[PDB]
Design an enzyme around this catalytic site. Sequence first.
Site, PDB file in Angstrom:
ATOM      1  N   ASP A   1       0.832  -1.206   0.000  1.00 61.55           N
ATOM      2  CA  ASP A   1       0.000   0.000   0.000  1.00 61.55           C
ATOM      3  C   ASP A   1       0.874   1.268   0.000  1.00 61.55           C
ATOM      4  OD1 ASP A   1      -2.332   1.413  -0.229  1.00 61.55           O
ATOM      5  OD2 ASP A   1      -2.821   1.490   1.895  1.00 61.55           O
TER       6      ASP A   1
ATOM      7  N   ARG B   1      -0.073   9.189   0.311  1.00 61.97           N
ATOM      8  CA  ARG B   1      -0.883   9.330   1.523  1.00 61.97           C
ATOM      9  C   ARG B   1      -0.341   8.505   2.690  1.00 61.97           C
ATOM     10  NH1 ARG B   1      -3.649   6.017  -2.260  1.00 61.97           N
ATOM     11  NH2 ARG B   1      -3.410   3.890  -1.426  1.00 61.97           N
ATOM     12  N   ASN B   2       0.585   7.559   2.430  1.00 58.60           N
ATOM     13  CA  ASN B   2       1.167   6.636   3.416  1.00 58.60           C
ATOM     14  C   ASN B   2       2.649   6.916   3.668  1.00 58.60           C
ATOM     15  OD1 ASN B   2      -1.259   5.389   3.921  1.00 58.60           O
ATOM     16  ND2 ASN B   2      -1.039   3.862   2.328  1.00 58.60           N
TER      17      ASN B   2
ATOM     18  N   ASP C   1       1.544   2.915   7.681  1.00 59.01           N
ATOM     19  CA  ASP C   1       0.342   2.220   7.235  1.00 59.01           C
ATOM     20  C   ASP C   1       0.631   0.832   6.717  1.00 59.01           C
ATOM     21  OD1 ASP C   1      -2.598   2.862   7.037  1.00 59.01           O
ATOM     22  OD2 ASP C   1      -1.658   4.896   7.050  1.00 59.01           O
TER      23      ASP C   1
HETATM   24  C1  LIG Z   1      -3.296  18.408   6.991  1.00 60.64           C
HETATM   25  N1  LIG Z   1      -2.663  18.754   8.281  1.00 60.64           N
HETATM   26  C2  LIG Z   1      -3.577  18.478   9.352  1.00 60.64           C
HETATM   27  C3  LIG Z   1      -2.803  17.855  10.535  1.00 60.64           C
HETATM   28  C4  LIG Z   1      -1.516  18.052  11.352  1.00 60.64           C
HETATM   29  C5  LIG Z   1      -1.441  17.457   9.948  1.00 60.64           C
HETATM   30  C6  LIG Z   1      -1.309  15.896  10.138  1.00 60.64           C
HETATM   31  C7  LIG Z   1      -1.194  14.677  10.237  1.00 60.64           C
HETATM   32  C8  LIG Z   1      -0.925  13.167  10.568  1.00 60.64           C
HETATM   33  C9  LIG Z   1       0.045  12.810  11.535  1.00 60.64           C
HETATM   34  C10 LIG Z   1       0.298  11.411  11.802  1.00 60.64           C
HETATM   35  N2  LIG Z   1       1.234  11.051  12.719  1.00 60.64           N
HETATM   36  C11 LIG Z   1       1.483   9.756  12.955  1.00 60.64           C
HETATM   37  N3  LIG Z   1       0.807   8.760  12.344  1.00 60.64           N
HETATM   38  C12 LIG Z   1      -0.143   9.033  11.462  1.00 60.64           C
HETATM   39  N4  LIG Z   1      -0.875   7.959  10.798  1.00 60.64           N
HETATM   40  C13 LIG Z   1      -0.811   6.599  11.335  1.00 60.64           C
HETATM   41  C14 LIG Z   1      -0.666   5.557  10.426  1.00 60.64           C
HETATM   42  C15 LIG Z   1      -0.565   4.245  10.903  1.00 60.64           C
HETATM   43  C16 LIG Z   1      -0.618   3.975  12.269  1.00 60.64           C
HETATM   44  C17 LIG Z   1      -0.796   5.017  13.176  1.00 60.64           C
HETATM   45 CL1  LIG Z   1      -0.872   4.720  14.945  1.00 60.64          CL
HETATM   46  C18 LIG Z   1      -0.880   6.328  12.728  1.00 60.64           C
HETATM   47  F1  LIG Z   1      -1.033   7.336  13.666  1.00 60.64           F
HETATM   48  C19 LIG Z   1      -0.397  10.420  11.146  1.00 60.64           C
HETATM   49  C20 LIG Z   1      -1.346  10.774  10.138  1.00 60.64           C
HETATM   50  C21 LIG Z   1      -1.604  12.126   9.894  1.00 60.64           C
HETATM   51  N5  LIG Z   1      -2.533  12.522   8.854  1.00 60.64           N
HETATM   52  C22 LIG Z   1      -2.379  11.946   7.497  1.00 60.64           C
HETATM   53  O1  LIG Z   1      -1.602  11.070   7.190  1.00 60.64           O
HETATM   54  C23 LIG Z   1      -3.121  12.333   6.203  1.00 60.64           C
HETATM   55  C24 LIG Z   1      -2.923  11.707   4.987  1.00 60.64           C
HETATM   56  C25 LIG Z   1      -4.299  11.544   4.140  1.00 60.64           C
HETATM   57  N6  LIG Z   1      -5.290  10.771   4.293  1.00 60.64           N
HETATM   58  C26 LIG Z   1      -4.860   9.443   4.455  1.00 60.64           C
HETATM   59  C27 LIG Z   1      -6.027   8.445   4.524  1.00 60.64           C
HETATM   60  O2  LIG Z   1      -6.923   8.647   3.476  1.00 60.64           O
HETATM   61  C28 LIG Z   1      -7.375   9.963   3.404  1.00 60.64           C
HETATM   62  C29 LIG Z   1      -6.212  10.961   3.276  1.00 60.64           C
HETATM   63  C30 LIG Z   1      -1.470  17.969   8.494  1.00 60.64           C
END
Ligand SMILES: CN1C[C@@H]2C[C@]2(C#Cc2cc3ncnc(Nc4cccc(Cl)c4F)c3cc2NC(=O)CCCN2CCOCC2)C1
Length: 277
Positions: A131, A135-136, A149
Amino acid sequence: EAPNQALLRILKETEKVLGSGAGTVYKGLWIPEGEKVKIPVAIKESPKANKEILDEAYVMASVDNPHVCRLLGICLTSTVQLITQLMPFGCLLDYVREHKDNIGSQYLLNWCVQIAKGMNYLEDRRLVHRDLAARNVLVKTPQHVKITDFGLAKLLVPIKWMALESILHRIYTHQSDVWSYGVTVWELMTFGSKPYDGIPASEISSILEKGERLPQPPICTIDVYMIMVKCWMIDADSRPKFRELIIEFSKMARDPQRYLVIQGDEMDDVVDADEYL
Ligand SMILES: CN1C[C@@H]2C[C@]2(C#Cc2cc3ncnc(Nc4cccc(Cl)c4F)c3cc2NC(=O)CCCN2CCOCC2)C1
């Protein structure tokens, strides 16, 4: 295969929303009891659902590399939550769309090197990500990105990122991850365009079988686009290896304006998770 001696840390709940959708990710602070340390974290939140998030936790706990995101622990107090290093600038897909007027060639090429280093590490661990997409890939700082992810990852669906042999025959290898890497690079070089925009997913395999591919982004020299196209060859073994991708984008990063043409290119005890070992 070697025993997986990774540690799965269970965190107590006593130790804002960033986004919700098809789960919920929160920003938070983790203060492991006893130690005088505040870690900025992200927190991702039925029996099937619990089983899938635990498979994700398994993989995420099992990786350790500067260009891959690692699980800090899980919390089991009502739902299963995954806790990880907060990546405060978000995913690269949003970031390149938001900062497109302010992103130079040096950054884009360095991100390509860093993503290939993370993927090469996953290949070393015999993990197929399945994947990879912008976005990942998350942004710790504009200078340091990491792959995340692991919910589809497996030891050796997003149709528009998948290798043809994956769409047709459900075959997944490190070389089909290379195809996804190509698409991810195209996302970055178009500042977050949607691949095959307009085309329904059911038509992608036939479009690919006819030899169609994503077009050359305006900022890309033929050098960079040719690397992308090599990632989309039919013969999986003809595609670059992640270790070659590291080398090639590293060379280009030493003279980035030769390879990408971009107009204008010329609180007391907080510890980041990377310093909490
Ligand atoms: C746009 N601003 C608003 C905000 C402060 C900003 C941010 C963020 C953010 C920080 C993360 N910090 C650690 N990890 C994560 N993801 C994660 C993945 C796997 C396991 C775990 Cl525990 C996780 F927490 C995080 C994910 C975050 N947002 C994102 O990726 C957005 C990407 C887009 N979408 C993905 C899914 O489809 C729809 C579109 C940017």
